[PDB]
């Protein structure tokens, strides 16, 4: 409540004098009532980063400070950054501080939550190392995901990043109580609006009756000031962990991407006058990473799972931002331009997808040996691409022809007609459960489905649908 004056501003950081005893605790919101160009009253929000002394605290501004002259009225709220939570956040796009930017109308549901909240205690945290079941066959077989775990993306443009995002969203929100909090820091606005209207036309945001959608969207725009692209991730995180804490959903979090968060942390800290760390990242790199990541776990209430893209500076994993991102990641899903150019979606790379979940005593000995044999078949074929598919062809070997044929079968079978590729490319969607993926690849390997055409497994769901597609193509063969 303490009315403070503005003493110093240097760009986005601010110096708010205060009454002598009462003073805001660190990480408290500060609304600095200001003016526009024509002087209409507008507000710039601040967050106390440092309690400098002599009745003066330093704050960093979540909005741009053009409109804030020295000696303005700065009102404290006493509590940290609050955002609305509930059903109002579902279906809308939000800014850093929770003022929505969909322009349909204001928010409701006067419950809220601080942006900075403690991690779940050591006693609450679940020990059961579950699997995040998905309608995708390859991230069920090759790279399984952990429930509550952290998954990284590395595929560039035109490989199907956003369709994979929407596919995870549809599968978790159909098979279970899936809620998807996409929080995009460093989101350039045109790609953000492209993402919004893609979600709009693909049926995951319902417009005739909003809030019955499946997604909640937060945008950290590029042109936003320093602390904004630090705090958008925590905005999306608290909006997701409300859904975890009170509705016991299986929440799906998306931070695309974590490198903009780390960079914005470095830039905030570099403007704060802190001595930087090794390569130039903020001195507090690991703790800033941890206080964002270790709020994304699985408790006895529910489980929030995050899939967060990563950009690696000149593909240098020795850099501190990737090497500290992987200290909390569990699996990786490296989409390929090669499987996009070949033309089989999803465009992931099975030889380059790693998971800590792919162990025998975690997901079964059967699933383990199936994945291991599939990897070995594809690793045969990748070296045999140069051998026979270019030059050799010397009736390679029947024990090697048996691998080349079924490696064709498996590269066709890895694809899957997505739910939201229907209006895009003409492919009606199918969910393929985990056990059905294992049994299908089991029978592709085990010498029971070598006789059918190699296209009988391409863009198909289960394995029975594959044998049925073989019969229908053979009816077209007898035609």
């Amino acid at each position: 409540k303490n009315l403070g004056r503005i003493a110093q501003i240097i760009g986005p950081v601010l110096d708010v004098a205060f009454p002598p005893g009462k003073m805001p605790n660190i990480y408290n919101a500060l609304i600095v009532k200001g003016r526009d160009t024509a002087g209409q009253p507008m507000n710039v929000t601040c967050e106390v980063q440092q309690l400098l002394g002599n009745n003066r605290v330093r704050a960093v501004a979540m909005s741009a400070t053009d409109g804030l002259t020295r000696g303005m009225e700065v009102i404290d709220t006493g509590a940290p950054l609050s955002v609305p939570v509930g059903g109002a956040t579902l279906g809308r796009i939000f800014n850093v501080l929770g003022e929505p930017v969909d322009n349909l109308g204001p928010v409701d549901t006067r419950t809220t939550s601080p942006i900075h909240r403690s991690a779940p205690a050591f006693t609450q945290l679940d020990t059961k190392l579950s699997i995040f079941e998905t309608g995708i066959k390859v991230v069920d077989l090759l790279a399984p995901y952990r429930r509550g775990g952290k998954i990284g993306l590395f595929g560039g443009a035109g490989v199907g990043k956003t369709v994979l995002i929407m596919e995870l969203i549809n599968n978790i929100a159909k098979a279970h109580g899936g809620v998807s909090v996409f929080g995009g820091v460093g989101e350039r606005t045109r790609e953000g609006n492209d993402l919004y209207m893609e979600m709009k036309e693909s049926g995951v945001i319902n417009e005739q009756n909003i809030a019955e959608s499946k997604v909640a969207l937060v945008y950290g725009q590029m042109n936003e000031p320093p602390g904004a692209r630090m705090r958008v991730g925590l905005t999306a995180l608290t909006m997701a962990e409300y859904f975890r804490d009170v509705n016991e959903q299986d929440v799906l979090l998306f931070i695309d991407n974590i490198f903009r968060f780390v960079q914005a942390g470095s830039e905030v800290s570099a403007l704060l006058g802190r001595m930087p760390s090794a390569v130039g990242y903020q001195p507090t790199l690991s703790t800033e990473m941890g206080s964002l990541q270790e709020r994304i776990t699985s408790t006895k209430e529910g489980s929030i799972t995050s899939i967060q893209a990563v950009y690696v500076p000149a593909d240098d994993l020795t850099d501190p931002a990737p090497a500290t991102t992987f200290a909390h990641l569990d699996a990786t899903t490296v989409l390929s331009r090669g499987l996009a150019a070949k033309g089989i979606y999803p465009a992931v790379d099975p030889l380059d997808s790693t998971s800590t979940m792919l162990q025998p005593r975690i997901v079964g000995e059967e699933h383990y040996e199936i994945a291991q044999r599939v990897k070995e078949t594809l690793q045969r074929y990748k070296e045999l691409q140069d051998i026979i598919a270019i030059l050799g062809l010397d009736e390679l070997s029947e024990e090697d022809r048996l691998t080349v044929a079924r490696a064709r079968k498996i590269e066709r079978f890895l694809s899957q007609p997505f739910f939201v590729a229907e209006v895009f490319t003409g492919s009606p969607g199918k969910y393929v459960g985990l056990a059905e993926t294992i049994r299908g690849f089991q029978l592709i390997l085990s010498g029971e489905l070598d006789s059918l055409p190699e296209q009988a497994f391409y863009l198909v769901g289960n394995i029975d649908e594959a044998t049925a597609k073989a019969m229908n193509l053979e009816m077209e063969s007898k035609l």
Binding site: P276, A278, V279, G280, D319
Partner: protein
């Protein structure tokens, strides 16, 4: 045919060694770049703290 097969084998060995040398050169290059960036930032903040 025997000398061409020996030649293919020698080129295979050379590709293996060249891949591995590329790997260790990339490793030391990452270290060189990171140390140079750090040295620049440290000399810059030291000079800024001096004045």
């Amino acid at each position: 045919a025997s000398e061409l097969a020996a030649r293919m084998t020698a080129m295979s060995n050379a590709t293996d060694n060249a891949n591995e040398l590329k790997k260790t050169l990339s490793i030391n290059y990452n270290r060189a770049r990171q140390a140079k960036i750090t040295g620049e930032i440290l000399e810059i903040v030291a000079g800024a703290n001096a004045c």
